[PDB]
Amino acid sequence: TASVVAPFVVLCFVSYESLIGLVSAILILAGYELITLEMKERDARFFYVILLALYPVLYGLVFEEPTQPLSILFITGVVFSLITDKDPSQVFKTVAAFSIALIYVTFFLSFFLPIYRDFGAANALLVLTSTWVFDSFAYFTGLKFGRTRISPRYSPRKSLEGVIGGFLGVVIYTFLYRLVVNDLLSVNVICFRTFLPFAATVAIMDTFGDIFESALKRHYGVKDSGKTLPGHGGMLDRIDGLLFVAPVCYIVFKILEGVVR
Amino acid sequence: DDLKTRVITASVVAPFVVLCFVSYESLIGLVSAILILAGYELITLEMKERDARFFYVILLALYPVLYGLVFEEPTQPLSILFITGVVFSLITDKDPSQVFKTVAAFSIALIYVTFFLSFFLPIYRDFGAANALLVLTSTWVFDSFAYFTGLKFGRTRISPRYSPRKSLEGVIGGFLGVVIYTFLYRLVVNDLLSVNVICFRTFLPFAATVAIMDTFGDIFESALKRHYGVKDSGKTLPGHGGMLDRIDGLLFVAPVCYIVFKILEGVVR
Numbered sequence: 353t354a355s356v357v358a359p360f361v362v363l364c365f366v367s368y369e370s371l372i373g374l375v376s377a378i379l380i381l382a383g384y385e386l387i388t389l390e391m392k393e394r395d396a397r398f399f400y401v402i403l404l405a406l407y408p409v410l411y412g413l414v415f416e417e418p419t420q421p422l423s424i425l426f427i428t429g430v431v432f433s434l435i436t437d438k439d440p441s442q443v444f445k446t447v448a449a450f451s452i453a454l455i456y457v458t459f460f461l462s463f464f465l466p467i468y469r470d471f472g473a474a475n476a477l478l479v480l481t482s483t484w485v486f487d488s489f490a491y492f493t494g495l496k497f498g499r500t501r502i503s504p505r506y507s508p509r510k511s512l513e514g515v516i517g518g519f520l521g522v523v524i525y526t527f528l529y530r531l532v533v534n535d536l537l538s539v540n541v542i543c544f545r546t547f548l549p550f551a552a553t554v555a556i557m558d559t560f561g562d563i564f565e566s567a568l569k570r571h572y573g574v575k576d577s578g579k580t581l582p583g584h585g586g587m588l589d590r591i592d593g594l595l596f597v598a599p600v601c602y603i604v605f606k607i608l609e610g611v612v613r
Numbered sequence: 614d615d616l617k618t619r620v621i622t623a624s625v626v627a628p629f630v631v632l633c634f635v636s637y638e639s640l641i642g643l644v645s646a647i648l649i650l651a652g653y654e655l656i657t658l659e660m661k662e663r664d665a666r667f668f669y670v671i672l673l674a675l676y677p678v679l680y681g682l683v684f685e686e687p688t689q690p691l692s693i694l695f696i697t698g699v700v701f702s703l704i705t706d707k708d709p710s711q712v713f714k715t716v717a718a719f720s721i722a723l724i725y726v727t728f729f730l731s732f733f734l735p736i737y738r739d740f741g742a743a744n745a746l747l748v749l750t751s752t753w754v755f756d757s758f759a760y761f762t763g764l765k766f767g768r769t770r771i772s773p774r775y776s777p778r779k780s781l782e783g784v785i786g787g788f789l790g791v792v793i794y795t796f797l798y799r800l801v802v803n804d805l806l807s808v809n810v811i812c813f814r815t816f817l818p819f820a821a822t823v824a825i826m827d828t829f830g831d832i833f834e835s836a837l838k839r840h841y842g843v844k845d846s847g848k849t850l851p852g853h854g855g856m857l858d859r860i861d862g863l864l865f866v867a868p869v870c871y872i873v874f875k876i877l878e879g880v881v882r
């Protein structure tokens with residue numbers, strides 16, 4: 353398990369098309385999970401799952417645009433649920449769950465597609481891992497440093513202190529990351545002023561992005577999003593903070609770093 | 614009680630709207646307005662709660678501006694309007710199984726209503742204020758012709774049992790009424806100025822989508838209302854029906870139309 357998860361992912365950031373393939377895979381998984389909490393029903397799950405997985409490809413390769421395939425994946429989904437679900441108050445339930453999967457999971461995750469394209473495969477790996485880096489440092493400095501509850505009563509506990517730490521761990525992960533990456537080739541990287549914010553957002557977003565998921569799970573009755581990968585936890589669980597991050601990161605990058613060819 | 618309250622609104626609705634397609638910024642302001650209304654309605658079915666409604670309402674109304682003026686991009690503000698919304702519901706709603714209910718309703722509002730309707734923003738920009746008005750009215754045009762040729766030309770049920778009556782026949786008619794509305798629309802508009810219009814091959818499809826989309830777009834809304842228990846989305850405008858009700862098929866149309874235009878007409882700026 354754990355020996356390949358880290359490098360398999362990374363080795364994917366090589367091609368734009370490789371990136372797509374990873375995002376696609378992750379979406380079938382994460383998507384399957386979030387949809388399965390609303391459907392234990394045979395076909396239902398699968399169709400909407402396929403939709404959730406198609407976006408990266410349609411967005412990146414088919415249309416060189418995002419909004420166009422987003423609208424039709426939604427439209428195709430609702431059409432389907434109208435055909436299949438004949439109880440109207442229920443057609444609403446599947447569309448609601450599919451609606452969250454589409455925005456939260458699918459739309460938000462495929463934000464790597466433009467982050468990669470417009471900011472170099474480099475910063476892509478940077479954003480992704482900076483969440484892993486924040487995550488560790490948030491845990492450690494959280495256990496031994498305080499009880500200031502920012503997390504809700506239903507969500508797994510989180511501290512202001514744990515975040516201020518994970519913040520710093522990202523702040524540092526970048527000095528290190530900068531040097532190593534401007535070296536290995538003349539590679540594009542997060543400049544020095546786009547540092548403090550990029551940390552701040554990986555901080556604040558992963559926090560909110562996980563709390564939102566935990567709330568999402570208390571509604572479906574579980575403490576795990578689902579079991580797809582034999583690894584520890586669920587696929588949606590290993591992603592949750594990353595979802596809120598990517599979008600906010602891409603915004604932060606454009607505001608503070610311009611563009612590429 | 615006067616006959617000037619029901620007629621004055623019937624006289625301005627049509628031209629007020631049209632007179633807006635003049636500026637890109639005017640278009641934005643109409644779309645913004647319509648979203649606060651339509652949005653207020655769809656959210657209100659899930660919330661009879663004081664603040665809740667209003668916050669998410671404002672979010673749903675902001676997208677057109679943020680998308681058109683602030684970011685010259687769509688996806689960026691879409692993601693943050695959602696994120697700002699969920700953050701809010703986490704703060705306010707403390708029951709997790711309920712935070713899910715408001716996010717679900719807000720989620721449909723965002724995509725269906727807000728995202729779909731503001732598609733006029735790019736349709737206008739990339740296809741000329743002309744075709745914008747063309748798409749919008751072509752739904753009004755399809756709507757009439759679908760009603761008439763529907764009453765007297767058939768009873769083959771395409772519409773669901775909870776949904777207002779619809780027939781394959783009524784659509785094949787509204788299809789044609791749009792097909793024709795364009796010959797007419799083309800001539801008048803290539804005349805009044807050297808104006809950009811739906812070419813002749815982009816005709817058959819544009820009809821087909823206004824047909825098929827308004828159909829699905831209304832059925833989805835009707836299903837949406839059966840869940841909330843009403844036969845009207847809400848009463849905002851004193852006019853007949855609700856604001857969301859006058860738009861429902863238009864939502865599914867705009868997106869699909871924009872796609873269809875790009876596939877078939879390039880960037881006729």
Ligand SMILES: CCCCCCCCCO[C@@H]1O[C@H](CO)[C@@H](O)[C@H](O)[C@H]1O
Pocket residue numbers: 357358361374375378464480483484487590591
């Ligand atoms: C397309 C970009 C998105 C990539 C998604 C791949 C998710 C792989 C899971 O990662 C794992 O998540 C844990 C939980 O945080 C970390 O502790 C651990 O070190 C890391 O190996």
Ligand SMILES: CCCCCCCCCO[C@@H]1O[C@H](CO)[C@@H](O)[C@H](O)[C@H]1O
Pocket residue numbers: 626627630643644647733749752753754756858859860
């Ligand atoms: C850019 C969005 C434009 C907003 C359009 C909706 C608000 C105007 C509604 O007016 C009426 O709508 C009814 C719906 O079919 C028809 O009875 C009639 O044709 C039309 O006069």
Ligand SMILES: [Hg+2]
Pocket residue numbers: 360361362363364370
């Ligand atoms: Hg790989």
Ligand SMILES: [Hg+2]
Pocket residue numbers: 542543544545546608609
């Ligand atoms: Hg810089």
Ligand SMILES: [Hg+2]
Pocket residue numbers: 628629630631632633
């Ligand atoms: Hg106007």
Ligand SMILES: [Hg+2]
Pocket residue numbers: 811812813814
């Ligand atoms: Hg033409």
Ligand SMILES: [Mg+2]
Pocket residue numbers: 562589590591592593
């Ligand atoms: Mg997490």
Ligand SMILES: [Mg+2]
Pocket residue numbers: 831858859860861862
């Ligand atoms: Mg209608």
